Design a protein around this ligand. Sequence first.
Ligand SMILES: O=C(O)C1=C[C@H](O)[C@H](O)[C@H](O[C@H]2[C@H](O)[C@H](O)[C@@H](O)O[C@@H]2C(=O)O)O1
Ligand SMILES: O=C(O)C1=C[C@H](O)[C@H](O)[C@H](O[C@H]2[C@H](O)[C@H](O)[C@@H](O)O[C@@H]2C(=O)O)O1
Ligand SMILES: [Ca+2]
Ligand SMILES: [Ca+2]
Ligand SMILES: [Mg+2]
Ligand SMILES: [Mg+2]
Ligand SMILES: [Mg+2]
Ligand SMILES: [Mg+2]
Lengths: 727, 727
Amino acid sequence: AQEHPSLILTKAGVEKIRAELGNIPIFDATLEKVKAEVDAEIALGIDTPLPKDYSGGYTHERHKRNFFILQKAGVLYQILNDEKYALYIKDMLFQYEGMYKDLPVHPQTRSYARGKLFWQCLNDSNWLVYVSQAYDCVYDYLSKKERKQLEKNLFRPFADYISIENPQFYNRVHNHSTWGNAAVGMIGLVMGDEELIQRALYGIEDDGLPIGAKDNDGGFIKVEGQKAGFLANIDEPFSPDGYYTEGPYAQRYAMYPFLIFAEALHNVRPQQKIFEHKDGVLLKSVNTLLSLSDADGEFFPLNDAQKGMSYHSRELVTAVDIAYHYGNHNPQLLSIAEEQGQVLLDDSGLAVALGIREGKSEDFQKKSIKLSDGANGDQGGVAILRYGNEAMTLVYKYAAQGLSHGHYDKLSFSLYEKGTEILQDYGLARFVNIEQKGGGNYLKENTTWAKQTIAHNTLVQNETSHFEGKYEVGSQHHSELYFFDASNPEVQVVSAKEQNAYPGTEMHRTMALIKTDGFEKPFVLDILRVGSNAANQYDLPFYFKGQVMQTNFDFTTPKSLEPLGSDNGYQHLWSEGLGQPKGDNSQLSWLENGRFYTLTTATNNDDELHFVRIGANDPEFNLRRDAGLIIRRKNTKNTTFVSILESHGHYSPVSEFSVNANSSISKIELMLDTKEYTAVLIDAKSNTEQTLLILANENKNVNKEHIIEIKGKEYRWTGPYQFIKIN
Amino acid sequence: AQEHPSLILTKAGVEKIRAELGNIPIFDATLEKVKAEVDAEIALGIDTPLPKDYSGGYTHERHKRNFFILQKAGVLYQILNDEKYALYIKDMLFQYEGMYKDLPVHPQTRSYARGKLFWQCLNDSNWLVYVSQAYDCVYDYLSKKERKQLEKNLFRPFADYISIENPQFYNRVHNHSTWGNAAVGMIGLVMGDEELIQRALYGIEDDGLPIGAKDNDGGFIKVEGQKAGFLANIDEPFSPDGYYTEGPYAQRYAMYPFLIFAEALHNVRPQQKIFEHKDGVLLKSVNTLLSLSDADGEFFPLNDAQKGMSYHSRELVTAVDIAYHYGNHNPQLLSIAEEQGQVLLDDSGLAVALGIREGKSEDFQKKSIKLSDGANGDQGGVAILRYGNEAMTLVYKYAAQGLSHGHYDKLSFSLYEKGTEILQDYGLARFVNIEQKGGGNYLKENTTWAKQTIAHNTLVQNETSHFEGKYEVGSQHHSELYFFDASNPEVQVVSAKEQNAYPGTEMHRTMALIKTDGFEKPFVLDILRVGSNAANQYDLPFYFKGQVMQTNFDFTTPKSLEPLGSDNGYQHLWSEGLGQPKGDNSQLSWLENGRFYTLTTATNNDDELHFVRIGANDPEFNLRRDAGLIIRRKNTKNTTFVSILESHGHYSPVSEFSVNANSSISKIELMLDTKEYTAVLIDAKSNTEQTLLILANENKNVNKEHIIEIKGKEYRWTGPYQFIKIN
Ligand SMILES: O=C(O)C1=C[C@H](O)[C@H](O)[C@H](O[C@H]2[C@H](O)[C@H](O)[C@@H](O)O[C@@H]2C(=O)O)O1
Ligand SMILES: O=C(O)C1=C[C@H](O)[C@H](O)[C@H](O[C@H]2[C@H](O)[C@H](O)[C@@H](O)O[C@@H]2C(=O)O)O1
Ligand SMILES: [Ca+2]
Ligand SMILES: [Ca+2]
Ligand SMILES: [Mg+2]
Ligand SMILES: [Mg+2]
Ligand SMILES: [Mg+2]
Ligand SMILES: [Mg+2]
């Protein structure tokens, strides 16, 4: 009784596509491009080489390309009704059938779960997700005898290999296991194998895995009390805001198996109600992911993330189209599809094409947003403050650990202006799929640099990373939201605390995005309040992008560059210059992509200002030679850092005009600096312009009245903060 | 008798413009933008502050902005027939008249010719060129009494100040003097003052200047026996190919006064035949300058050049429109005008707009080109070799000294792919008009780093710059063309020699851009043959752009960074790693803007391979932290460096696919290495792909027969080289 195809491309979908071909431009353009790709591969023949290589290498790239081409051939067969596509799928499947059973585990030994076609089970699982879709498309074209042999000798052994033979890969809450569960589930659905479908949804019972078993990136395989399978992978790593705990680079990857397998489940097993699971989180998570991109569509590089990954990727084409068709037809998704310029060649892609043709498209709104972390939304979060039409974007990370790929960077932030990074989060130390760089895999410096606290724009105590850079400790902890208030577009404030990163120390960081009179643009205000039980060394880095223009302090230029320290990331920084503050406010200004920036920070006379450059202890040139300025405050117990980051003016090498190149800050001053209250006065060099930010530190309640005095003057307000103009 | 205006905007021009307004989109759009700009400044008022500042500072930027706005107000007055513009010009001129006479020499003392309005006479001259045009536009609106006072108390004294009172500025063959000559000449022509007109054309008679005195940038003020004035500035620093000896950044700046003053001379003194002068060189030089830009229209950064200067600049808007109107109406110039998206608000800009409306536009062809240097084309040259549609561009500099801004860089090259710099020429050390960077003026490191040989991709002998970095030596010498042959678009070759850079050493460098079977793209072949009479240390830098991917040799990574040397630029390089070749060919690959590149060079086992990084002894962060690889060959007399630079493959962080990431070179071998003949064998990996280049070094005659033997086999050809496929 089951029709084929039916999981993703459906028979009713084929009919409708055919009726519309020639009058759906984005679809017609995709079809033509895909037809040319597949026809090219058909001319080259069928190559199924004996495994051997890591990423970037021939056997990896060939087997990878085969999976993409098979899924494309399948939809081409159905849409065009042209058997050359089916014959190619059939021949290729049988060539795999003739080699796969005789293969020995991948000869490369790095993976905690060595694959057969690829170095790791993750890529074997990618292959099966894509190939299942091809099989659904040729299932009726094949004879019963042919299906029986493929299922017995190719598909069933393959599905076992990436599941019951490698439970350490398959049975976790992790993007790996989501790929594995989907692979097993997609082929199960095509075949009507109820055992495999149950294994996909619920995992393996009694896996026998030992205590403390880890993956290659330092993460635990299993967590006590945690379920396995697809449904557990929806329930645990997504918050109620649709925020995926590994961060957006990983979320981007995981959306393919999440949304493909959900779509398949919706079409074949509607009683599962997969698109309702956890209050509709999968569909919601698509809007959330799109909001975690800068003005160019590039995902913010939180935790292990390669820069340049964006919503133009194949996973976001898939996610946008599926969310459009199976969700409530959000017309904002249509504008993303138009930017992508392609669609899936299936029912969901057609629906997007027709939505565009009918003039339904609306601009995707990028707004200030609060995202909770943890399954129940109580394990910290991430906040994005935006000004104007994405004119300025502040990303503040007060999240949980983030699994194996997570960084030791409680309360870090990064800053963007219209697609240009100004203060960065480093991302990963890996050149993804570039064979010549460690087989395209994680490099040693991902651990030694990238993940360490000193690499991030946040507080480092005693040259030690948050939670001593120990996964097993960090994974128990998260920062805590104090408050989020972005209702006033001119004055948006978020605040969070962290008391476990350094036991005996409390960090309370408040960030604001503020437009006020005297300034050409909004500025970022950063208040980092530190309470401790002992005198420590505190470092606060700012990793800035651009060319240094000016400072209001002197600094030394050493004749030779030495590393800043010996451990925990400090071995990777060259000491490029050492300054002493001239007064209460120190300034550093730079030029990046035609715009000037100024960092102003409240300094004491014993502060050290360290110019740094990344690149020490990097024998393979695995790290970028980016710079930073670190404020070091020695022998200090309780302290409050106060900083402003301004954007002003411009420079063009065409006109040779430099405009508004100086700061407009006259003075920043702490007026009150106690446990209960923090008050910062901001004086704008614009003649007469003064503002006062007051924070109540010990009670967040929006209806709580506060009464303080500053120089004999009473200030009275309700709620955790006030911003006032001083006249 | 003389009409006003008539120099640049003419009265028949004004009538034709008014008849066409509203049906000439590029002109209509420009008029609207300029109207809004001038109307804004009129609302702000008239400010003529007491001069104090360097470039980027308030008084410099305000007086500069006034000159641009006055010239815009003048054409607006005429075109729109609206006396608001004329009244603004009058009021501003009278405000200048009230202050100028009482002003003392600019108080900044860092110009060899301090101005009055500005720190230097160069900028006073800019002001007068622009204001002259405005005066022409309001001449009839003013009363005779008003003109008399302006002329007596502002214009005549101004013109004298920048000329007869500062002959050291005014009477040279130099871009400065071209601006000074045009300033005096433009105001002379508006006024009908024969004295000033002659002074402009023919210079100051008996100037009394010392021969051997220097300007602040280290070049000679005056050359014995050399004429002065506008005509001398056309005859002397332009070659017969329209190449301006100072290089394209400076040529760009000089075109404004050259073409503006030439246009005024054409309209007011047609008997001068200015557009025929030196065989039409001024019109020709516009094409030449456009040919000295990369695929994005950015000028190659030869000699003192700021990167990002482009044909979108105000000077090239001006040059393009004038050359179109007064030259032979070359329709290729119309495509540049379309990219610029604006035109001059005058007769020439009208002619461009009409050319575009009538569909005359044709694409500007960027070709391989040989440019001679020196007034008679015998003082070396510059070669540009291009492949395909600016797919790859090699720039080879074998020029004369280049006057004061020239670099010690005989036979250096740079390499570009579709607007991306792959191997660079550093350009200047100066942040043009950015006050915070030493007043926007040349920095100390422009002499200590930028101009030195070690900063360039060319031979350095015994850690010493060409000509010992002395202007008085280098200014007497030039490299010599051996041959240029670009007729075969697959195999283009240029060769030059230099024997005075290091007395007792001969450098013979041959560069080729070669497309052959077995390579996806054209490659650069570089043969640097060196003959000497002592054993020396030879250094060969390659300043590459991008992320290091791979080497075929081991290298050390020191625990601290030390400077590479003590003098002549080596004090600005950190030694970042030291390698020794493993074989006959050493390889370095990198990734830049999505593409891979491989440098392969013939090494002896005693060679040292130095990774370097610019930035030592740079206390104010005036230098970029770019990298290089230096080949160092010690204790060597005669040697030949052979290198290939390939472009291959692609990387995308969206798809995460790395394609064709390895070199296709199997080997390069020197088959013959004598004074008379050089032969280089290139084997591609494809196997069956082998090529041989043979150079005859002591006879360039295209009809001379050569017979040689290599490995027992006879090779016979005519002319200075042969490139043959070995079968
Ligand atoms: O194709 C891939 O192997 C791949 C693509 C994703 O974009 C992402 O880079 C993913 O990283 C893996 C990695 O290959 C290892 O399996 C391990 O470190 O886990 C990573 C992950 O969890 O995403 O790999
Ligand atoms: O506005 C300028 O001062 C200016 C514009 C040109 O683009 C170019 O940069 C030029 O440089 C001058 C410099 O200001 C000094 O006058 C001296 O060093 O000479 C340079 C030159 O001849 O170009 O300045
Ligand atoms: Ca990070
Ligand atoms: Ca140079
Ligand atoms: Mg998961
Ligand atoms: Mg942004
Ligand atoms: Mg001035
Ligand atoms: Mg470029």
